[PDB]
Write a protein that binds this ligand. Structure first.
Ligand SMILES: [Mg+2]
Ligand SMILES: [Mg+2]
Lengths: 356, 357
C-alpha cells in the first residue's frame, strides 16, 4: 500500500533536507497520498489525529520552503487535485475571471458581476468558474450545473457559471484541515487553475501577492497552455483590478509582459475598498440585479460598485480584443448594461438551468 | 480571547512563515507554554483536539524547517518552558550526570547508564543519572523514583537513576504527537537539559552532530550555569565517546570555548567497530552489564569491546570529576571500581533503596 502515512512522511522528510529534495512531481504524488488519507478521516479517532498531524506537517514544511510558490510545483499540485475532479467533455473568445482570494479585503464579488456584464458584449462568451453563492441566490439551483449538463447548456448560453465545490471533490477532502491550519498553503492558489472546461482560451486571474504573481503567471501558462492570461494584483493588496490606486498586470500571450492600471485610465474616480465592500452572496446578488444590471446607474454617477464592475468588465473586453483601449472597454461595458444585453444573458442562463 | 489558545499558537506559527522568521527565543518559550496547555486540556475525540494537533504539528514542523530550534537561546528557552510542567527535586543545601541527545541513528550499547554505575563505585564521586529501560529490568520499579522520593534516596546512594517520564509531565503531553509526526523536533534535543536535581555539579552531554555541538555547549551553559560540562560528539556520528575513531569534546569550564580530541589509544585501548558494541535489548544489556562487566568477568587488556566502551566513558567521567585529562588514571579508577565490587555494590544499594519505597 503506497498511499500510506509512511509514504507521506518520506515526502515530508525530503522537505526537511538542506537543501530540500522534494521535486514538483514528488509534490503531485504527495498530494495524491494526502487526498487518499484525508478520505479515511470521518471521525476524531487517533488514526485521524495521526493523519492530520502528518498532513499539517507536510503542508507547513512546503510553505516554509516556499516551493508551493514555484510555477512547476503549483502546476503539479493543480494536476493532482484535478485527478479527484469531474471534467467537462465538449466537442470564438471564451473567458473566465477569478482570483486566488487570501488578500483579506472583504470586497464585492466583481469577478461574477463583470463576468455577467462581459457576457452581454457581442462576440464574447463567458464560462465563469468559482464560488464557495451569488448566482445561487437568484432562484438558480447551481447543483444542476455539472459535468453532464454543461455540454447541453453550452451552445445557447453567452454566460455560464460553474460552482467549483460540485466539480472538485479533492478540494472538499482538505476543507477541514485548511480551516484548522489557519495558515496559507498550496491549496489557497489552486482554485483559478482548476477550470473543468478546456475550451476557455483567455482569463483574468487575480492573485493576493506581488511576490507570487510572476510565478503564478508561469503556472497559468503551464496549466492553461492555450490561454492568453492577465494575472492582476492591486497595490493596496487585492486579487482584483483595484478601485483605489494602481494594479500591476502580468500578461502571458501564446514572454512575461507587465503593465499598470489605475481608475483614471478608464475615466473613473477612485473608490476606497470600504466603498466596494462585500455584503455576502444574497445582498451582493440583489445589488447586482437591482442596482447594476437594471441600468439604475450610469458611467458618471460615481457609484463605487457600478464603477468597480464597469472597470473590471473593461479589462475583460480589452483582454478579449487584444488591445489596451480601456475607455473603449468602458463604452462596451456601459452598452452591455444599458442595452439590457447583460441582464438578458444572465436570465438566459438562469432559465436554461431551471429548465434542466 | 485567552492567552492559552489556538489563536495565540497560530500567531507564533505565522512568525515562523515570515522571511526572515520573526519568532524570538522568548516567543518559542511562550509558544511551548501554549502547546503544553492546549495538549493538557485536550477533550478526547473532540473537533478541538483535531484542530490542536493540526496547529501543534504545524508550529513544530515550521520551527524544524527554520532550524531556529538548534540555536542556543532557543534550545534553552524551550528547555525552560518544558520544565515549567516538570516536578523539580527540592534537596537540603562531586555529583555528575552522563546522557546523550540520541538521534545519531546508532543502536549501540547503553554506555551512559553503564559508565554512570561504574563511576558511582569510585570513592568521592556521586552519580545522579537522568534519562530514558536497562535499570528497569534489575528488580526495582523506577515509577517509585519521583520528585517526592529522590530526597529520601539522596543521602545514602552513590548511584541514582531518575527516569525522565516520572518528572517531565510536559514531555508526557507531547509524547503522542511526537510519535505521529515521525520527524525530529525541538523535543529531540531537550532531554539532557531537563535534569530535575540542581545539585548536579558536572556532566557529559553527548550530541548526535558536529553542527549542533557548539550551540548545544552554549545552551548547556544557560540551562546549567554552575556546571563544568563536556559536550561530546563521536566523529563516526555518535552522541558518545566513540570506541572507534576520534571524539571531539567541547569543554564548558566556568572557572576559566576549549575543544580537544579523544581516541581509544589515549586510554590504552584498541579501537572497536560499533557493530561489536551493539545494544542486545534492555533485558539482555542488563545481563551483559551485570554478568560480563560488574561481576569482573572481563578485565582491562581482554579487549572485550562493550567492556572497553564502558571503561573509556567511565574514565572520561572520572577525569571530568577531578579537573584533569589523565585518561589512563581514569581507566585505573574505572578498573578498580569494577574489580573491587564497588560498582556492583553501588548499583545494588540503589536497587534496594528503591525497593524499600
Ligand atoms: Mg477578491
Ligand atoms: Mg547514544
Amino acid at each position: 500500500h503506497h498511499m500510506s502515512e509512511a509514504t507521506l512522511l518520506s515526502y515530508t522528510k525530503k522537505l526537511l533536507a538542506s537543501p530540500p529534495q522534494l521535486s514538483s512531481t514528488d509534490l503531485h504524488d504527495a498530494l495524491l497520498v494526502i487526498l487518499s488519507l484525508l478520505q479515511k478521516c470521518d471521525t476524531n479517532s487517533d488514526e485521524s489525529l495521526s493523519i492530520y498531524t502528518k498532513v499539517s506537517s507536510f503542508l507547513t514544511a512546503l510553505r516554509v520552503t516556499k516551493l508551493d510558490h514555484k510555477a512547476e510545483y503549483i502546476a503539479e499540485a493543480a494536476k493532482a487535485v484535478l485527478r479527484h475532479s469531474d471534467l467537462v467533455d465538449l466537442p470564438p473568445v471564451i473567458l473566465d475571471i477569478v482570483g486566488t482570494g487570501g488578500d483579506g479585503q472583504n470586497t464585492f464579488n466583481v469577478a461574477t458581476s463583470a463576468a455577467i456584464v462581459a457576457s452581454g458584449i457581442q462576440g464574447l462568451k463567458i464560462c465563469k468558474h468559482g464560488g464557495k453563492d451569488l448566482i445561487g441566490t437568484l432562484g438558480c439551483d447551481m447543483f444542476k450545473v455539472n459535468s453532464s449538463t454543461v455540454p447541453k447548456l453550452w451552445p445557447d448560453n453567452t454566460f455560464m457559471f460553474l460552482l467549483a465545490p460540485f466539480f472538485h471533490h479533492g478540494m472538499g477532502h482538505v476543507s477541514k484541515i485548511r480551516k484548522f491550519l489557519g495558515i496559507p498553503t498550496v491549496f489557497n492558489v489552486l482554485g483559478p487553475l482548476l477550470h473543468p472546461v478546456s475550451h476557455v482560451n483567455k482569463r483574468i486571474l487575480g492573485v493576493y501577492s506581488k511576490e507570487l504573481a510572476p510565478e503564478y503567471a508561469k503556472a497559468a501558462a503551464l496549466v492553461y497552455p492555450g490561454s492568453e492570461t492577465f494575472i492582476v494584483w492591486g497595490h493596496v493588496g487585492l486579487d482584483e483590478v483595484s478601485p483605489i490606486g494602481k494594479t500591476t498586470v502580468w500578461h502571458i500571450d501564446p514572454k512575461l509582459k507587465t503593465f499598470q492600471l489605475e481608475p483614471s485610465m478608464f475615466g473613473l474616480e477612485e473608490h476606497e475598498l470600504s466603498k466596494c465592500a462585500s455584503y455576502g452572496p444574497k445582498e451582493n446578488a440583489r445589488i447586482l440585479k437591482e442596482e447594476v444590471l437594471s441600468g439604475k446607474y450610469h458611467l458618471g454617477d460615481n457609484n463605487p460598485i457600478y464603477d468597480y464592475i464597469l472597470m473590471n468588465t473593461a479589462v475583460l473586453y480589452c483582454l478579449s480584443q487584444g488591445h489596451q483601449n480601456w475607455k473603449e472597454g468602458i463604452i462596451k461595458a456601459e452598452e452591455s448594461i444599458h442595452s439590457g444585453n447583460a441582464l438578458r444573458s444572465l436570465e438566459h442562463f438562469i432559465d436554461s438551468v431551471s429548465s434542466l
